[PDB]
Amino acid sequence: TLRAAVFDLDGVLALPAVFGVLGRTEEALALPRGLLNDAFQKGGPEGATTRLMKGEITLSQWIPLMEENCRKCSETAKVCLPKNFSIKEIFDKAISARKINRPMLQAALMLRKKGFTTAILTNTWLDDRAERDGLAQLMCELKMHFDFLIESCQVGMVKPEPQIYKFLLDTLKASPSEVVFLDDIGANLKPARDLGMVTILVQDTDTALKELEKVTGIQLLNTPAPLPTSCNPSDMSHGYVTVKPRVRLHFVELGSGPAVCLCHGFPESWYSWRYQIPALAQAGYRVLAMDMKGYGESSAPPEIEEYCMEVLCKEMVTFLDKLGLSQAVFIGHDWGGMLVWYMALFYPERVRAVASLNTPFIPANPNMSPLESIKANPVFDYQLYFQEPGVAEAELEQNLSRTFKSLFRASDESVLSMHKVCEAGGLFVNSPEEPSLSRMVTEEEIQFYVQQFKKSGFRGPLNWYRNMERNWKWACKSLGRKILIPALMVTAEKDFVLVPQMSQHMEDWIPHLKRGHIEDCGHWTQMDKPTEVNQILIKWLDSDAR
């Protein structure tokens, strides 16, 4: 019958607890046992600490009142505090040391996923120290995972006053027997028990999680590692920039710090980076995930030459100019990866660092048209099928649900004949009309892509393939150059089109190239192996793009 779980911050969701530092400070300074804890609670409901927790005063106003409390306590104990005693120094180190208790947060996320309402109820203060940003960052990371955050200093009440428990129940819209309450301080559990709530005293994490498992009937300990956190489209900041008359680019933006621009492939969306966007922002970066030209909310003009590399790269430079960005890190996948190599070759001043997932850097052959290279290979027969305007559009737009369900599949779930596409007369000729759902995607995720492609269709996206000769002529101007800015190439073991061996001569052009490799990964890298992608990108950004 439980349907809500309430957690404390200090000592429960974040470790170590502040009170723990008071005891460790006493032992380190050879002070009488409990002395700093007595000064902290000095006065009870009338004391300085209660005024602080109720929001009457700020942390900087409380520090000298706590220092005065430490002297009154030392005088009655007949001891002398060291000459270098500082409450600010002690509290600063305690707050900095506090980190998220990962297994406790994972249990909260699992309960929320199974239908529970989750909340944080904490005794906290108005932090106005010069170092207050460290605390703001902690709260931001936690608050996105809970339904409610109730802070004592904002509501004017504190634990253990019985009215804060009534306020909590009114907010949750639940009766006490439907609520689990976790706290590390016994006195704070007593009022919740008097009301009828299930209480768990937190001394060590594992024992508290075992009690929680037993009482909710859900497995929380020994569970598989969850997928990274993903975006909700309606919670994102949406940005719109006009780069040319009748050409507007849409993007999604999150975080602060060095700008990182994400460039998707075919036939994708900004939504293909849903697992990377929160991870990269949390790592200290300002992420801009684009809808490339021809896709989603970006403009989709019908003319073929609007999609040649020269025009696309120039519009990306105009995008940085209108946003007031002198530089950005460029990360691309598939057609987006092809574009980011050309950005580094033609506009290195604007590119802080360049990374490509799956797409190798392949230099143009001045002795052979790209049409002849494509005809002398059976794996690229689909590129000839994509040439005639109207042909692939009619097949791909006929049933959008079938199109995305057939393309977005893991390497072992393939349902498409990759060869003799032209001979067969289409991409889906030997394919089922109702394909099964892949393990990589949910029905809700597929429907987001369906909704986006209902707006402009496949004309714009397919035109990226209809400029082979124009792109070849433009690329021939860079054959004498080398890429000498920080670069990363990530290969995917099981990509059918972009095999890892197609990247082996890149070191001749990018002599200081860094590499990444993902085993058991197909073409749709970001959604196939999201944890592995995040780890490779974050490590490279922190060392080579900082």
Added chain:
Amino acid sequence: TLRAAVFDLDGVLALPAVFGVLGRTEEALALPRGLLNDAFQKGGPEGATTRLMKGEITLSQWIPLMEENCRKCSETAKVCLPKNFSIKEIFDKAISARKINRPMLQAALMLRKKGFTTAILTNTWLDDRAERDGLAQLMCELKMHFDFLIESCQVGMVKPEPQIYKFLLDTLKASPSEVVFLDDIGANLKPARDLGMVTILVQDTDTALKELEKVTGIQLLNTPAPLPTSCNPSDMSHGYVTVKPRVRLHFVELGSGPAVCLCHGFPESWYSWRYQIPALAQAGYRVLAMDMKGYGESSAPPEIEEYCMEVLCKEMVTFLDKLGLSQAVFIGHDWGGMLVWYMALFYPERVRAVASLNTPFIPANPNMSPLESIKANPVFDYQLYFQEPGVAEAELEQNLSRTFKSLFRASDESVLSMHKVCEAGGLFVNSPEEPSLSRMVTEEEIQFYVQQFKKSGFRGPLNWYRNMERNWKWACKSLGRKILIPALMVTAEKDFVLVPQMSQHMEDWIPHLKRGHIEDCGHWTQMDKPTEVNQILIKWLDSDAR
């Protein structure tokens, strides 16, 4: 008959020139005269430097070819280069030293304002050095002021080849006798002269500006300092965030670096910060200029309680959460300034620094309702007029052009009876039906505000005045606190409503408060004295908010 002016970058728009460093390096190192200049030009059209300027190779590829050229030149001169000789060190220092030639840029801006087409035509390279950002920033600042930027390394041609001059004329759509060409290198003028263009050899800035004045008939030297650069609404990045169902906030965004949030007053728009937005972004900040709730493209719900301070401050915190910002600097004016003091009092962790233009911090009096304080003063009689829903709306919405033309005026151009507004029966009862245009604003600027207020009217904006009792009750909770984060108060000498003497007791609440004062400034601070505002804010941000 002149209608286009073309400028070189090196030696003309940016000083000192690169060639100037080669000569100064020779003198400093006691090398033979002209040695480094001979190595630089070694090979002519077939030499390394021409390949660099045409985009065949990058700057890092050219450095060791230039080092080899310096050795071949030294061998034939029978001299030895010092043991610590480095082309990279020499070029790095030269590029860093180069700064915008302010009077040359001012002359370019004046000509553009008088109808001329302006362009930069330069011999430049693909910069891939680790320090390339310094150059990208320089180009970004310059490119926003010119119609065209033609770089040799992007077009594959160089000065003095005659085809680059033909390419320039085709781009400008003009005949040679309609073009003025400025360059510091004589050889680069010769082809432009052969075509019939007016040429100016730049040796010193003043003499070149005198020749330019004489030939265009426009005064360029000894002119009054121009106003700061202003935004074009259609060139801005527009951002939209949903903070609550049916409540979406619109903002304009520019720059990179620490986030700065601008909060306008009544009855204004994000457009009221048009002179501060480019200046703050250029100073190294990421500016977010809001349309506050009830205004422009932000949501404007009709309910009065949607505009009380508690709700407004909470939505501003949700805005930072959805954008992934742990902190922002908050700068407000008028009603926006009132809001930023309450953000610092209730959410100090989220506020890096706080600044208010005109609006002082006035603490609530727990012994008297704000309605009684307003009735015991004749200058605030307009606040009683704004109380009754529908009354001030009908008068202010009747003729939008008259409304904005009557309000947006300098201190000496006032046309409104400020007292006995209720007795008189309105704000505009003794006002002309067609008021003259103020010197602060253009007709085009007034029409932007007219267009914005056509969407939602005055209901939302007026509701900010209809929560006096609710705001008073909420503010009473902070009477024991002090503002101890970095703070700035800016007073305006001639503001009729917010007189500087209303701010005199702020030091009791904000003991380390910094101050600014603007003489001969009325209520509309940002557009009345924009240069003075920019200088006060930039100085304070760089010292107290960095």
